[PDB]
Structure 1
């Protein structure tokens, strides 16, 4: 199954992968985010958020400053290329987005925007 990827965030602040490759010839791409482990959303929440490498920092800072009610994202943060809901243990969220929103030779980062000082629940994303 190209044009999708299953990804997990555990009670350890770990994504089960840190490099996503998106196939140049997908019209759309889907991220299937789950949470094993036993910790609730308010303690060990994870979302999967996509931005350019450059924007990641800003998106995170403004995101944490948005609070739990906003899934730790700034409302209408135009830097956020795509994102899932914030999930807790045993929950499950998907996000599909147009691959046309991605550009060749750019660094993208995926990450979780839930609080933790110097991080980071992060990973790279890239076309191919």
Structure 2
């Protein structure tokens, strides 16, 4: 199906969508993240992380101390389904993953793990 989405993240700490819908007829799904505005990654960086909805805040908390060099994610965090790098204004990244990782009957979300951003920057992923 349509197996790719592009999400913008802003200088006002927001993603420009609240839901990522994944059609089940995709073996592989690609999320592209762009960052508009002009703020660099060390002041207003953003990544996009996909996990179980319950796991979003715990992943964020463990990422706090990993720092920007590890994309604010604890190295090898198994709760993470897929993630982009932390990007600043002007940059882009994408991550492609097996849609098969998303166990049906489960609730998944996406979020930014840059410290403090999760409170505003999260949404749902919906398998259809």
TM-score range, shorter chain: over 0.9
Structure 1 residue 82 corresponds to structure 2 residue 82: yes
2:11 aligned counterpart, secondary structure: coil
Q: What count of residue pairs does the alignment treat as equivalent?
A: 128
Alpha-carbon deviations, 1:11-30, whole Å to 9, x = none? 01110001111001101000
2:21 aligned counterpart, secondary structure: strand
2:16 maps to what in 1?
Answer: 16
Work out the CA distance in 2 between the residues paired with 1:26 and 1:117.
Answer: 30
User: Residues 118 and 4 (structure 1 numbering): CA distance in 2 closer, same or farther, change over 3 Å?
Assistant: closer
2:119 aligned counterpart, secondary structure: coil
Name structure 2 gaps, 5 residues minimum: none
1:121 maps to what in 2?
Answer: 121
Name structure 1 gaps, 5 residues minimum: none
Alpha-carbon deviations, 1:67-90, whole Å to 9, x = none? 112110110000000000110010
Relative to the length of structure 2, the TM-score reads: 0.95
Work out the CA distance in 2 between the residues paired with 1:125 and 1:117.
Answer: 18
1:52 maps to what in 2?
Answer: 52
1:99 maps to what in 2?
Answer: 99
CA RMSD in angstroms comes to 1.3
Alpha-carbon deviations, 1:84-122, whole Å to 9, x = none? 011001000011000110111211110000012771310
Deviation above 6 Å: which 4+ runs of structure 1?
none
Relative to the length of structure 1, the TM-score reads: 0.95
1:30 maps to what in 2?
Answer: 30
Judge conservation of contact 1:30–1:96 (CA < 8 Å) in 2: yes
